[PDB]
Amino acid sequence: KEMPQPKTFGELKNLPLLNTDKPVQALMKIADELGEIFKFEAPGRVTRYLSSQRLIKEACDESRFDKNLSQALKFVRDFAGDGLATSWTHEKNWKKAHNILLPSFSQQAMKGYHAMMVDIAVQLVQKWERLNADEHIEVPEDMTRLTLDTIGLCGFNYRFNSFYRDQPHPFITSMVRALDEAMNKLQRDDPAYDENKRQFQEDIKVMNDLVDKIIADRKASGEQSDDLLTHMLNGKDPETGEPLDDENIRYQIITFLIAGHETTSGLLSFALYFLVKNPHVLQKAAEEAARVLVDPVPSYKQVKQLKYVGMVLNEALRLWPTAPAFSLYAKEDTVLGGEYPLEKGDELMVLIPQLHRDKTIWGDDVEEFRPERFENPSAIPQHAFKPFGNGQRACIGQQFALHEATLVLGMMLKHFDFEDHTNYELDIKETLTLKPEGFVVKAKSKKIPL
Amino acid sequence: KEMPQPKTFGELKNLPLLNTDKPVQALMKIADELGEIFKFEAPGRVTRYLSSQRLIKEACDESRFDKNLSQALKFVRDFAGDGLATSWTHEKNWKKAHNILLPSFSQQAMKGYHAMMVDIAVQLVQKWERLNADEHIEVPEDMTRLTLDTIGLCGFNYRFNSFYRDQPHPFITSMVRALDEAMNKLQRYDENKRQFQEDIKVMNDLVDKIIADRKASGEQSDDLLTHMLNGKDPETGEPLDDENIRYQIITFLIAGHETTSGLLSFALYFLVKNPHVLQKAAEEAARVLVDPVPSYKQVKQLKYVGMVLNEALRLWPTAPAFSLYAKEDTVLGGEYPLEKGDELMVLIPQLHRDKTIWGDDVEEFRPERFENPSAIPQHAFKPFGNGQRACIGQQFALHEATLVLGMMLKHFDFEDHTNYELDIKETLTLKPEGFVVKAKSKKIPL
Numbered sequence: 041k042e043m044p045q046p047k048t049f050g051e052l053k054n055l056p057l058l059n060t061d062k063p064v065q066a067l068m069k070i071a072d073e074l075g076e077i078f079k080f081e082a083p084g085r086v087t088r089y090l091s092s093q094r095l096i097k098e099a100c101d102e103s104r105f106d107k108n109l110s111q112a113l114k115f116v117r118d119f120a121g122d123g124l125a126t127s128w129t130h131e132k133n134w135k136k137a138h139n140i141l142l143p144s145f146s147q148q149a150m151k152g153y154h155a156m157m158v159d160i161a162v163q164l165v166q167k168w169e170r171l172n173a174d175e176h177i178e179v180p181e182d183m184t185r186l187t188l189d190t191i192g193l194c195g196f197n198y199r200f201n202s203f204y205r206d207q208p209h210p211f212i213t214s215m216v217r218a219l220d221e222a223m224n225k226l227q228r229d230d231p232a233y234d235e236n237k238r239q240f241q242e243d244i245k246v247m248n249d250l251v252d253k254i255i256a257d258r259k260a261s262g263e264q265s266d267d268l269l270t271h272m273l274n275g276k277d278p279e280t281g282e283p284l285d286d287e288n289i290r291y292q293i294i295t296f297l298i299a300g301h302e303t304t305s306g307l308l309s310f311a312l313y314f315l316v317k318n319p320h321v322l323q324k325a326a327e328e329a330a331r332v333l334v335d336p337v338p339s340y341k342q343v344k345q346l347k348y349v350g351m352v353l354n355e356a357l358r359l360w361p362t363a364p365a366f367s368l369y370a371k372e373d374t375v376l377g378g379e380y381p382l383e384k385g386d387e388l389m390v391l392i393p394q395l396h397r398d399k400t401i402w403g404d405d406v407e408e409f410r411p412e413r414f415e416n417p418s419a420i421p422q423h424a425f426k427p428f429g430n431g432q433r434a435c436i437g438q439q440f441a442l443h444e445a446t447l448v449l450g451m452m453l454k455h456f457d458f459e460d461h462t463n464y465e466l467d468i469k470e471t472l473t474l475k476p477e478g479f480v481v482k483a484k485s486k487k488i489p490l
Numbered sequence: 491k492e493m494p495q496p497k498t499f500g501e502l503k504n505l506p507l508l509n510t511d512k513p514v515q516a517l518m519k520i521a522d523e524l525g526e527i528f529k530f531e532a533p534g535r536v537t538r539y540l541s542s543q544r545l546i547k548e549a550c551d552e553s554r555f556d557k558n559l560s561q562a563l564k565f566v567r568d569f570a571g572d573g574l575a576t577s578w579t580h581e582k583n584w585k586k587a588h589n590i591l592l593p594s595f596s597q598q599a600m601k602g603y604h605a606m607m608v609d610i611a612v613q614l615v616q617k618w619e620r621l622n623a624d625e626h627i628e629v630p631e632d633m634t635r636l637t638l639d640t641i642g643l644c645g646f647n648y649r650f651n652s653f654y655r656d657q658p659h660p661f662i663t664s665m666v667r668a669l670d671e672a673m674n675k676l677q678r679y680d681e682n683k684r685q686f687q688e689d690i691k692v693m694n695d696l697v698d699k700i701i702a703d704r705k706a707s708g709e710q711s712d713d714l715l716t717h718m719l720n721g722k723d724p725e726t727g728e729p730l731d732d733e734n735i736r737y738q739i740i741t742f743l744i745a746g747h748e749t750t751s752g753l754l755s756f757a758l759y760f761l762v763k764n765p766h767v768l769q770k771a772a773e774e775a776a777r778v779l780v781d782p783v784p785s786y787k788q789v790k791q792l793k794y795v796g797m798v799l800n801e802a803l804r805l806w807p808t809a810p811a812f813s814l815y816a817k818e819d820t821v822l823g824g825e826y827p828l829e830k831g832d833e834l835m836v837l838i839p840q841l842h843r844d845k846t847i848w849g850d851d852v853e854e855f856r857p858e859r860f861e862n863p864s865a866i867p868q869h870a871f872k873p874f875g876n877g878q879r880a881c882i883g884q885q886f887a888l889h890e891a892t893l894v895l896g897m898m899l900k901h902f903d904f905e906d907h908t909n910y911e912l913d914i915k916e917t918l919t920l921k922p923e924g925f926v927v928k929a930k931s932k933k934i935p936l
């Protein structure tokens with residue numbers, strides 16, 4: 041009945057607890073101490089962090105709870121607009137874009153993106169083939185170059201050419217800095233933050249200008265590509281009969297870059313981390329890659345056959361889900377778990393990494409990396425595994441993210457042996473997403489041509 | 491390219507090779523001679539027996555192969571109907587029952603069955619505590635009493651009361667005799683047919699009566715029957731009808747009781763034949779089972795007992811084969827072209843003796859081989875089948891067997907007093923026939 045709450049700071053309540061550079065990890069430790077639910081209070085804000093499958097399966101009942109914009113998402117909305125990830129369910133543009141975009145994100149639609157994904161994946165493999173002896177790989181940096189360029193090419197047929205650069209494309213610099221400002225605002229306004237505010241407006245303009253220009257260029261040329269921009273310029277919502285307007289198309293493209301690039305590169309980085317830390321698993325994944333990927337270029341069908349690589353990726357998502365939380369609100373007064381009364385509008389946060397450590401679902405070995413947990417997908421209870429969110433507001437990019445990550449991890453394991461030459465100590469850097477900071481490896485080529 | 495084939499008998503092709511009382515063991519010896527794959531032909535039937543992890547890992551690719559009803563399963567279907575084990579994947583009732591029953595067979599659902607499992611396990615322990623000096627234990631006989639009563643109680647709150655009986659419950663007599671007829675048909679009668687139909691009627695009547703009785707009472711139990719009466723398939727939104735609920739219950743009794751009792755029997759056999767392993771397992775039981783009654787959480791802590799059970803399943807998987815068909819034209823192992831619909835048999839005991847996977851000591855009983863599942867190559871260990879058509883009862887079988895073996899090792903020292911010679915009787919499942927032991931109580935109360 042009475043809900044636990046972490047230590048307070050006078051008038052600031054719990055807010056200074058977030059003034060740390062690893063806040064998800066801090067909230068996980070609080071959940072370890074306090075259990076499946078705790079109240080978190082700040083000036084003008086009350087939320088409740090959920091950690092157990094028992095309570096989260098109720099919060100995922102869409103008849104009782106809808107997606108809420110967390111404060112992080114509210115700040116991202118200042119540049120993602122009413123794109124899919126930062127719009128309320130009841131906003132006309134959510135269901136409209138949802139209906140238009142769902143068919144272009146299906147498993148069937150990955151067949152059309154596959155060639156462009158391969159284009160960037162081959163660039164990654166060639167970069168590593170061309171490293172000199174005793175040079176090493178900066179794993180999240182290269183994974184970020186890959187996922188960013190893949191979304192750019194599949195999203196709107198634009199080449200950021202990240203593998204030709206040390207300093208990223210100006211669009212990426214402004215996007216990352218806008219995401220940085222969004223996160224820093226969460227932890228803080230006085231006169232000192234005026235420079236950050238001016239820079240934020242400048243970063244927003246940089247993003248809008250490039251994306252609006254590409255949309256305008258495409259409309260003028262009339263050319264058709266296999267990208268999401270072409271689908272959005274031609275698609276009509278069956279319900280309203282309307283197409284997306286140019287401004288919303290821009291917000292969707294920005295959304296694809298934000299929501300997809302760091303989550304996916306984080307997944308690849310964590311997966312490779314767990315592989316080099318678990319040589320029996322790496323051997324098993326590498327066997328499958330060599331057996332399945334029998335052609336110099338992987339095909340769409342071959343990627344679907346990388347079952348164990350997929351298990352590796354799901355187990356990496358279990359331990360470190362790279363979009364680590366989502367937010368809900370009670371549609372009406374309701375009681376959570378038979379003991380927590382909630383009033384209409386009350387907010388909930390789903391702490392995904394804690395959910396994925398619920399021993400009552402996964403057993404005592406929750407911290408061990410064992411892809412075999414996912415050997416048979418049916419053994420996983422409902423709402424125990426939620427790296428892609430919930431229900432109609434789940435990740436629309438799930439099939440894209442997993443197809444890219446399976447393709448690329450498969451190619452990495454086919455073409456190279458990996459050495460954890462520094463005995464890397466896991467250090468998880470937190471933005472709005474999670475990644476293993478400073479993770480480096482050496483790759484020895486297996487000399488298999490492309 | 492050219493596939494080996496065992497000796498033939500003119501027009502009968504390979505079929506007389508199955509007219510033996512140990513056909514699985516015969517097929518293993520054929521695989522020893524011919525290798526990882528051989529063709530087996532009979533009038534109007536062609537199949538291919540696979541024995542190597544190399545080929546079986548491809549056969550387990552669900553995009554290329556789906557479950558086939560072997561001739562054994564087709565004959566069992568005459569009384570298991572379209573229950574889960576004897577239905578095709580494309581039959582509406584398979585996916586429907588699969589979606590409904592999966593949550594009631596989960597590891598989480600074992601918490602709710604645990605009390606009833608302990609009920610029967612205590613009856614087994616008390617039976618052995620009450621034996622007189624120099625009396626002995628008929629191991630497969632008592633294990634079958636336990637697993638049969640455990641499924642009856644957890645399945646539909648029915649007590650066969652097997653530990654009160656010499657002659658089994660009439661349902662079991664008809665079930666066993668129906669399974670016997672199914673197997674005998676494979677090797678080939680007007681009286682057999684009349685008897686086969688009588689035994690089906692016994693099974694349907696009792697099970698239909700319990701379903702009707704439960705519907706009339708409105709009472710709720712912690713059993714599979716209550717879940718089936720109240721569950722709805724999320725996909726179609728439909729519940730199982732009463733006829734299919736009957737077939738599922740019959741299926742649970744068939745598919746679960748003899749496979750699981752064989753596992754316990756083989757496990758105890760290998761333990762008494764390997765005293766260092768027995769001692770290690772007994773040390774775990776005493777350290778872990780600190781209460782008069784094991785808890786669910788304690789059973790999960792019996793790690794080495796679980797490894798004992800997996801190693802017993804490696805050597806003698808008690809559901810010893812399953813069948814597959816090619817969904818499309820495909821090439822197996824890069825050298826064996828198969829046409830759509832072509833059939834495969836997975837010879838599990840031979841798979842589990844693949845020296846390229848397990849090393850040269852494949853015949854030795856070493857539970858330590860299972861310390862880390864990640865070190866085991868993909869599809870090397872398939873005692874519970876494959877993919878979406880894998881054993882839905884796997885967690886049930888292993889929880890029961892771990893609980894019961896744990897309690898046995900806590901409460902008794904065992905003696906292989908006859909220096910028993912392994913003799914594996916074959917029905918549709920495998921068991922060590924005539925396996926007997928003496929148990930000396932450690933005098934630990936319940």
Ligand code: HEM
Nearest residue numbers: 124125299300303304307363366428429433435436437441
């Ligand atoms: C492993 C990589 C990814 C993970 C873990 C992930 C995770 C998530 C999660 C948890 C949500 C729900 C957030 C909430 O409820 O507030 C979400 C939504 C979303 N994601 Fe992803 N994501 C990934 C990759 C991608 C990619 C590659 C794209 C685009 C190509 C994408 C686009 C979106 C969009 C548009 C939404 C909002 C959907 C809606 O509400 O209609 N994501 N994602």
Ligand code: HEM
Nearest residue numbers: 574575745746749750753809812874875879881882883887
């Ligand atoms: C150690 C004991 C057991 C073993 C070795 C075993 C083995 C197997 C195997 C190999 C299959 C796949 C057969 C095929 O592909 O044709 C299977 C399926 C099945 N088993 Fe078991 N089993 C055991 C215990 C149980 C128990 C206790 C139950 C029920 C309570 C059960 C119920 C089933 C069912 C319903 C299926 C069919 C699942 C489906 O296709 O949807 N089994 N079992």
